[model samples]
Target: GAGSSSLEAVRRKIRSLQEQNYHLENEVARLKKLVGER
Candidate 1:
């Protein structure tokens, strides 16, 4: 039970990290566009 619970937690953490990375990439693209406009 404990092993399975830990594995689930790790999976959740990785999923959250992937979402955050995706948002960061989007923000970087927005900044690049603003810079290019200048």
Candidate 2:
């Protein structure tokens, strides 16, 4: 396997995106429940 500094940055980007996805999903679930209950 081969890797470099630029590739590492891309890896970081992927990690950040995963975090965002997790956060947004949680937020959406919370909102959906709030509205559904109302």
Candidate 3:
């Protein structure tokens, strides 16, 4: 119930989500790059 595989599965999922969040953040940054703030 408290082994690496079990904990790792959850960690891996969180890591995956974090990676996706970073990817989306980059995409959003690219979109904003054109609209430089004043």
Candidate 4:
């Protein structure tokens, strides 16, 4: 039961990080486009 609980927490954290990374990638893409225009 302890191991399962830890695993669940880790999965939740991984999902959160993945979402953050997705947004960061979109921001980086926008920045690149702005720089290219200049």
Q: How many backbone clashes does candidate 3 have?
A: 0
For residues 1-38, write the lDDT of model 2, one tens digit per residue: 25787788898899899999999999999999999887
Residue pairs with backbone atoms closer than 3 Å in model 2 (clashes): none
Which tens-of-lDDT digit does each residue in 1-38 have in candidate 1?
Answer: 56988989998899999998999899889999889885
Q: Estimate each model's TM-score.
A: 0.59, 0.64, 0.57, 0.57
Deviating ranges (above 4 Å) for candidate 2: 1-5
Question: In model 1, which runs have C-alpha deviations exceeding 4 angstroms?
Answer: 1-4
- Residue 34 lDDT (model 3): 62
The parts of candidate 4 lying over 4 Å away from their true place are 1-5
Worst 10 residues of 4 by lDDT: 1-10
**Residue 12 Cα positional deviation in candidate 1, in Å, after optimal superposition:** 1.4
lDDT of 3 by residue, 3-37 (tens): 99999999999999999999999988887886765
Task: Quote model 2's TM-score.
Answer: 0.64
Top candidate by TM-score: 2
**What's the lDDT for candidate 4?**
0.90
Better of 1 and 3 by lDDT: 1
User: In model 3, which regions exceed 4 Å deviation?
Assistant: 31-38
Q: What lDDT does the true structure give each of the candidates?
A: 0.90, 0.89, 0.89, 0.90
- Lowest summed lDDT over 10 consecutive residues: which window, candidate 3? 29-38
Model 1: what TM-score? Answer: 0.59
Residue 3 of candidate 4: its Cα lDDT? 93
